[PDB]
Amino acid sequence: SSFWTKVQYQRLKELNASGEQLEMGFSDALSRDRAFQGIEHQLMSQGKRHLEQLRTVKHRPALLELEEKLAKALHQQGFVQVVTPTIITKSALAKMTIGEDHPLFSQVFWLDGKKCLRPMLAPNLYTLWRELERLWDKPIRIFEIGTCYRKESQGAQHLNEFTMLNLTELGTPLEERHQRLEDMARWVLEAAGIREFELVTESSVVYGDTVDVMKGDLELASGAMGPHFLDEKWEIFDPWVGLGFGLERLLMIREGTQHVQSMARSLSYLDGVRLNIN
Amino acid sequence: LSSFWTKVQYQRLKELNASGEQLEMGFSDALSRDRAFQGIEHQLMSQGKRHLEQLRTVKHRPALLELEEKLAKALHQQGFVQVVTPTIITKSALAKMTIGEDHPLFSQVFWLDGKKCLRPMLAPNLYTLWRELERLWDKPIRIFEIGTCYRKESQGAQHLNEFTMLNLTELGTPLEERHQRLEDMARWVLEAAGIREFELVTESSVVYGDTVDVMKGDLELASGAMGPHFLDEKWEIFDPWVGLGFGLERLLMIREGTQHVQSMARSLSYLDGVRLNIN
């Protein structure tokens, strides 16, 4: 009836110990300790092995292989990729809501009294939409892949630095909005190797007719469409659809993993492998 | 040659990547001037629109993104392992780059709070990876990273708070081959970026190791160094090594011969070197 001690559970965890392995039980406190050195060793061996694949054939971790595969898949559907500032103005962050109540101000990393690290890509993409609409015929399709920051979590699994992928279409014919939302989820998720997922539609006073792509309980992405009450402040007058994916979750929810930090930007892990091993 | 572009017209033609010729030309008076302006602006805008049409119909991604992929693949080919590290670093990390209130680096940095700031360079994170990997992989160990870095101060006429760096390194380079290895790194990167002429100026500082800079005539394309280095002690590094760092936007600017370093940087007012403010 003796189970893993603290440090043992936490160590095995970083090493991506299964859920079952973690729930293992032993008779005596020493018998346990013996088999501990046993599992850790096996898991370490796997990490070294995987790291060997990175050194000799991949040459880049999953996050980057995923980004390229997703970008290419969208370039193929005629999406134009853009790269915008990670540093946005207070003024821009404010337009992300109506009224003088800007909840987002309490969860962002302020650099200045005027500047902050973007916690999302929407304000930048909103800006480009307005500019491209005057230059390009619709539908207009653009997306971006990049780091976003949020100083405070909503759960003990929300990273400070995370990678997002927002793709949008300005000019979507109204009756095609839902279908286009499905297309986007399909193009991205299939390209990531995830075929199962529901498009749980929803509609709130605020969020509006918001869409949540999910694989059971876990949400892979969040999307919305326009006319949207935020279009006024941004000067957008065309209907649209957009979807935002958190790439670390996609990596997580793909190669089934314990912690999401195993593959997020890090110094402790390399391509999902803890570094202080064997 | 009596009247030249107003401090407003000059600035506008600059944004629209007007050539240095156009920026200088003068005229008889305010008219011949204000007429040639709208005439040049119009041509520059047709240009930008045309370049954007290429982006929209065939490239599907801007120069910065295209360059990043070419450079990364070129290094994967020479056996370099690409890594991705956090943009937020500790005060300790920054300090190990020898400093405190000592060097103004602490004042050139964007602090998020009392113990963390946005990385102004990629060195500390790579320093950490060397340490970890030296225990798992046979040397020479080759790794590199392409990522955003932050500095809140201007050095030259150009200044980006957000810039993209490419730092490649080799841990375990034999002493007698360091200079050559720097040549190689300089070559693999720049040649892939489409820049053919450049020189590695090695300054054997009589005070602090050897400082290396890749120069293009008078412009600096990359900054580097080699170990043993006086900072290796704190980072627990003991092997010889070489590293080179490149600012991608600057590289792009140098190559395409453009006015602003921001026209191809992360932006909201530019897209693939083109000012959106056009028609």
How many alpha carbons fall within 13 Å on the CB side of residue B69?
A: 11
Q: Is residue A157 helix, strand or coil?
A: coil
State how far the Cα of A130 lies from the Cα of A226, in Å rounded to an integer. 14
State how far the Cα of A129 lies from the Cα of A235, in Å rounded to an integer. 10
Counting one residue from chain A and one from chain B, the pairs whose CB atoms sit within 8 A come to: 108
Q: Which whole-number Å values give the CA distances from A139 to A8, A80, A166, B277, in the listed order?
A: 55, 12, 16, 20
Residue from A82, A149, A162 to probe the interface with B (highest B Cβ count within 10 Å): A82
- How far apart are the CA of A51 and the nearest CA of chain B, in angstroms? 9
Q: Which whole-number Å values give the CA distances from A86 to A38, A164, A198, A200, A250, in the listed order?
A: 45, 12, 31, 30, 21
Would you call A135 and B64 a contact, using CB atoms and an 8 Å cutoff? no
Checking chain A for breaks where C and the next N are over 2.5 Å apart, the residues before them are none
Residues A82, B64, A189, A205, Cα dihedral to 10° = -30
Residues B71 and B163 in one domain: yes
Residues B2 and B73 in one domain: no
- Both ends of chain A: CA-CA distance in Å? 29
- How far apart are the CA of A3 and the nearest CA of chain B, in angstroms? 31
**b/e code B63-94 from CB counts within 10 Å (16+ = b):** bbbebbeebbeebbebebbbbbbbbbbebebb
Residues A17 and A120 in one domain: no
B128 at interface of A, judged by CB pairs closer than 8 A: yes
Spatial strand order of the sheet with A161-170 comes to: A80-81, A140-149, A161-170, A240-246, A218-226, A211-215, A198-201
Q: Containing H/E element for B229?
A: none
Would you call A55 and B81 a contact, using CB atoms and an 8 Å cutoff? yes
Tally Cβ neighbours within 10 Å of residue A272.
Answer: 23
> Three-state SS string across B89-143, please?
EEHHHHHCCCCCCCCCHHHHCCECCCCEEECCCCHHHHHHHHHHHHCCCCCCEEE
Residue the block writes with tokens 């050195």 = A37
The beta-carbon neighbor of B84 closest among A61, A124, A278 is: A61
Look up residue B216 and give its two tokens: 């293009």
- Resolution in A for the shown PDB structure? 2.5
- How far apart are the CA of A43 and the nearest CA of chain B, in angstroms? 15
A108, A151 Cβ separation under 8 angstroms: yes
Look up the domain containing B216 and give its range.
61-279
The beta-carbon neighbor of B86 closest among A109, A132, A266 is: A266
Closest-CA residue in chain B for A112? B110
- How far apart are the CA of B198 and the nearest CA of chain A, in angstroms? 28
* CATH number reported for the structural domain that contains residue A48 in this entry: 1.10.287.540
Residue from B268, B270, B274, B279 to probe the interface with A (highest A Cβ count within 10 Å): B268
Q: Is B100 left (phi over 0), alpha (psi -120 to 50) or beta?
A: left
Q: Which whole-number Å values give the CA distances from A222 to A243, B107, B221, in the listed order?
A: 6, 39, 41
Residues B38 and B66 in one domain: no
Residue type (1 letter), B153? E
Look up residue A151 and give its two tokens: 């100083």
Task: Estimate the crossing angle of helix A62-75 against helix A177-192, to 10 degrees.
Answer: 140
State how far the Cα of A21 lies from the Cα of A39, in Å rounded to an integer. 8
Please count the structural domains in chain B. 2
Q: Which whole-number Å values give the CA distances from A274 to A13, A63, A211, B21, B84, in the listed order?
A: 10, 16, 35, 56, 14
Final residue before a domain boundary, out of A59, A84, A101? A59
Residue from A72, A80, A159 to probe the interface with B (highest B Cβ count within 10 Å): A80
A235 at interface of B, judged by CB pairs closer than 8 A: no
Q: Which of residues 54-93 of A touch B (CB under 8 A)?
A: 54-55, 59-61, 63-64, 68, 71, 75, 78-87
Would you call A83 and B62 a contact, using CB atoms and an 8 Å cutoff? yes
C-alpha closest to that of A248 among A118, A62, A121, A81? A62
Task: Let me know the angle formed at the C-alpha of A233 by A232 and A235, rounded to the nearest 5 degrees.
Answer: 60
State how far the Cα of A214 lies from the Cα of A205, in Å rounded to an integer. 21
State how far the Cα of B42 lies from the Cα of B34, in Å rounded to an integer. 13
> Three-state SS string across A93-146, please?
HHCCCCCCCCHHHHHCCECCCCEEECCCCHHHHHHHHHHHHCCCCCCEEEEEEE
A275 at interface of B, judged by CB pairs closer than 8 A: yes
Q: What is the DSSP string of A227-251?
A: S-TTHHHHT--S-EEEEEEEHHHHH
Closest-CA residue in chain B for A76? B60
**b/e code B240-265 from CB counts within 10 Å (16+ = b):** bbbbbbbbbbbbbbbbeebbbbbbbb
Please state the separation of Cα A265 from the chain's center in Å: 12
The beta-carbon neighbor of A135 closest among B52, B88, B132 is: B52
State how far the Cα of A158 lies from the Cα of A122, in Å rounded to an integer. 19
State how far the Cα of A228 lies from the Cα of A239, in Å rounded to an integer. 8
Local structure of residue A54 (DSSP, 8 states): I
Residues A39, A43, A48, A52, Cα dihedral to 10° = 140
Final residue before a domain boundary, out of A37, A59, A81? A59
B chain contacts of residue A151, beta-carbon cutoff 8 Å: 112
- How far apart are the CA of B34 and the nearest CA of chain A, in angstroms? 25
State how far the Cα of B226 lies from the Cα of A267, in Å rounded to an integer. 22
B56, A80 Cβ separation under 8 angstroms: yes
Task: Let me know the angle formed at the C-alpha of B204 by B202 and B208, rounded to the nearest 5 degrees.
Answer: 125
Residues A7 and A138 in one domain: no
- How far apart are the CA of A110 and the nearest CA of chain B, in angstroms? 7
Would you call B55 and A127 a contact, using CB atoms and an 8 Å cutoff? no
State how far the Cα of A45 lies from the Cα of A274, in Å rounded to an integer. 11
State how far the Cα of A261 lies from the Cα of A249, in Å rounded to an integer. 10
Residue the block writes with tokens 């800006």 = A127
Residue ranges in chain B assigned as alpha helix (H):
9-15, 20-24, 30-54, 63-76, 91-95, 105-108, 123-134, 178-193, 248-256
C-alpha closest to that of A29 among A8, A51, A59? A8
Look up residue B230 and give its two tokens: 């006086």
Residues B19 and B69 in one domain: no
Q: What percent of chain B is helix, strand and coil (3-state, nearest 5)?
A: 40, 25, 40
Alpha-carbon Rg for chain B, nearest whole angstrom, is 22
Residue type (1 letter), B196? R
- Which residues have CB under 8 Å from A249's CB, separation 6+? A218, A220, A260
Residues A71 and A45 in one domain: no
- How far apart are the CA of B276 and the nearest CA of chain A, in angstroms? 6
Q: Which of residues 156-195 of A touch B (CB under 8 A)?
A: 160-161
Q: Which of residues 102-121 of B touch A (CB under 8 A)?
A: 110, 112, 118
C-alpha closest to that of B57 among A210, A140, A166, A260? A140
Tally Cβ neighbours within 10 Å of residue A256.
Answer: 9
Residues A216 and A103 in one domain: yes
**b/e code B206-233 from CB counts within 10 Å (16+ = b):** eeebbebbbebeeebbbbbbbbebebbe
Tally Cβ neighbours within 10 Å of residue A33.
Answer: 15
The beta-carbon neighbor of A270 closest among B83, B110, B276 is: B83
Final residue before a domain boundary, out of A9, A30, A59? A59
B31 at interface of A, judged by CB pairs closer than 8 A: no
State how far the Cα of A126 lies from the Cα of A244, in Å rounded to an integer. 14
Residues A171 and A145 in one domain: yes
- How far apart are the CA of A64 and the nearest CA of chain B, in angstroms? 8
Residues B48 and B168 in one domain: no
Look up residue B26 and give its two tokens: 């003068």
Residues A102 and A3 in one domain: no
Q: Is B164 left (phi over 0), alpha (psi -120 to 50) or beta?
A: beta
Experimental method: X-ray
Please state the separation of Cα A111 from the chain's center in Å: 23
State how far the Cα of A109 lies from the Cα of B251, in Å rounded to an integer. 30
* CATH number reported for the structural domain that contains residue A135 in this entry: 3.30.930.10
Residues A28 and A163 in one domain: no
